[PDB]
Structures are given as structure tokens and as C-alpha cells.
């Protein structure tokens, strides 16, 4: 897996792929 | 939070998975 | 319509729309 | 859910913000 | 809505979502 | 083919292809 | 239009630049 | 232009909408 | 399913998954 | 190939890394 | 065509579009 | 490599095409 900074929509999409059917929470606050 | 851990710092796949449901 | 690709577009769109308040993605 | 409402029809940003926190 | 810098394809996609059926013009010059 | 998702990909592609000269998106 | 020409068939970058300004 | 307003500066949804058709 | 759009999503996903080791895309 | 395996069904990251170098 | 820095998934997608049926190799090492 | 040429420096369409198959 990539070893780098992931930000914004890129981070969100990464969570999407990695979490799969579990889904995820995106709480950037 | 996820921004400090994975956007300002680098996250592993496991750290990234801490934010799954 | 492949639900998975649509999902990708949906979480991007929700990133923009929700901004600070964020969202939960629960298929 | 968001997938059924928005994957066959187009959802606007106003309909999409229903699914925000 | 997000309060942040939007650039390149990210800005374009944001316009896409926000403008909807009106469409938009992308004139970055 | 869901025209909206395709549209998303299309405006990204046009971003790259058109570059400086830009484009108008008018569904 | 671009949607009909390019959403069922693949458009190359050369066909896509038709739709630039 | 849109780059100076929304990429170098931050735009609101209304400023962003100034660039719709 | 339009194979081309799916392909777009696939090469993004492979970017993330493969990281350093990279990949070959050969339709 | 990746297109047939993954464009009709969902591939996980574990199935996707099969296609890495 | 755009004259600018292309990085990460953006660079990859650019290769996707530009290379078409030839495909491409993404070797960032 | 492609990162030095097109991400740290700018690539033309031809330089970018050096990385097609
Ligand atoms: Cl799609
Ligand atoms: Zn980006
Ligand atoms: Zn798509």
C-alpha cells in the first residue's frame, strides 16, 4: 500500500477502498 | 484525528483502518 | 449502474458538500 | 439510502447534504 | 459546503457538482 | 451508462486535454 | 454532443479536444 | 478569474456559482 | 458497465494499492 | 483480466494487489 | 494539452487518458 | 523517471507518452 500523505477527497477515496463494506466515518474537524 | 494522522503525517494501512466503521 | 463506482463519486461529492460537518458512509 | 436515491437519479448538492452529519 | 482552496480538476469537478444542469465555463487563463 | 458519472469523467478529461484554452460544459 | 459521442463509445484525447475552446 | 478567486483564495458556494452558465 | 470509466477507477485504486511497487496497465 | 474480474464484481484491495508488480 | 505538474493519481489518470489502448506502465520508484 | 520528469518538472504530451507501452 502507498506510504504517503493523503488529503481531502484523496484521503476520502482511500478510506472508501480500504474500508469496503464496513464503510467509514469522515470527521475532519 | 484523521487529517493530522494521515494528511499531515503519513498513515499505514492499519492506521487508515482505524477510521473504518 | 455499478453501485461501487457510483459510491466512489458519491463520497467525493459528499466530501465537497458536507465539508467540515463530515459524513458517515455505511453501505 | 443514498445509493438508491442517487445512483439511478441525479442528486443535487441540496439533496446530498441530507446525508451529512 | 467545504471552505478551502480548490484547484485544477478538483475545482472543475466542484463546478460540475455545484452548477448541475446549468453547466459551467472553465476559463483558467 | 449513467450520463452523470460519465460527465464527471468527461470534465476531468477535458480539464487535461484543453488545458489553457479551457472549455464550456453545457448539458 | 459530447455525452452521446463519448459516453457509449471511447473518445480519444484527439476527439475530446474538439470540445475545447 | 476563477483560479485567483477559488484556488489561490477561498471561494464560497456563491462565488463558486458565479462561474456557472 | 462501461469498461473505460471502470478502468479509470481501477488505475486510481491500483495507484493506492500498489504504491511503490507500481503496476502495468495493459487493456 | 482485471477488467472482467473487477468491473462486474467488487474487488477488494487484497484482490487488487494481485495486479501489482 | 495542459502544461503543469502532474502527480500521484492525477499523473496516473493522465497516462490512462493519453495512452489509451496502448496502456502504460506506472513505475514511480 | 516519470515522477521527476512530470511531477517535479513539467512534461509535454510527448514526454508523457514516453511512459505508454
Ligand atoms: Cl463511473
Ligand atoms: Zn488531487
Ligand atoms: Zn466513475
Swiss-Prot record, chains B, D, G, H, J, L:
Disulfides per UniProt: 6-11
Source domain of life: Eukaryota
UniProt name for this protein: Insulin A chain
Organism of origin: Homo sapiens
Amino acid at each position: 500500500f502507498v506510504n504517503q500523505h493523503l488529503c481531502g477527497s484523496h484521503l476520502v477515496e482511500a478510506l472508501y477502498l480500504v474500508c469496503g463494506e464496513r464503510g467509514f466515518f469522515w470527521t475532519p474537524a | 484525528g484523521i487529517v493530522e494522522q494521515c494528511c499531515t503525517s503519513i498513515c499505514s494501512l492499519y492506521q487508515l483502518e482505524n477510521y473504518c466503521n
